[PDB]
Amino acid sequence: AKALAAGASTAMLGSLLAGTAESPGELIFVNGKQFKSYRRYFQDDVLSEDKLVPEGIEGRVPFRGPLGTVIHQLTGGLRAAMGYTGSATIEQLQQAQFVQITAAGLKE
């Protein structure tokens, strides 16, 4: 909402979508949870520890679920901002004003 109000027309998302079902990667199950990983021939031992864990356990990204739910949450936030600022369109949102806050305003 702030980026659009500053005058941008769209936003490019990136890390907010890296763990979704539609993003590239492989879905794995580790320690009671779902993860995404960006992951053998000569390991013929049937009782070795590598057969007891999924491949790609290291460097795994958490799983976020369907993309539509993420997009719906983001759009709900944007619509709430548009309601607060009286912006019927994105072009009207681009005319909204800011208030600058201090360091105390970010202190929990």
**Residue 103 touches its own copies, criterion: CB under 8 A:** yes
Q: Is 79 annotated as a binding residue?
A: no
Active site residue 40: yes
Q: Is 38 annotated as a binding residue?
A: yes
**Residue 88 touches its own copies, criterion: CB under 8 A:** no
DSSP assigned state of 95: T
What residues have CB less than 8 Å from 63, skipping those under 6 apart? 19, 21, 27, 33, 34, 35, 36
Give residues 43-72 in contact with its own copies (rule: CB under 8 A). 43-49, 51-53, 58-59, 62-65, 69-70
Of 70, 79, 57, the C-alpha closest to 15 is 70
> Alpha-carbon distance 6 to 82, whole Å?
13
Question: Which positions lie near its own copies, rule CB under 8 A?
Answer: 1-2, 5, 7, 16, 19, 27, 29, 32-34, 40, 42-49, 51-53, 58-59, 62-65, 69-70, 73, 76-77, 80-81, 83-86, 97-108
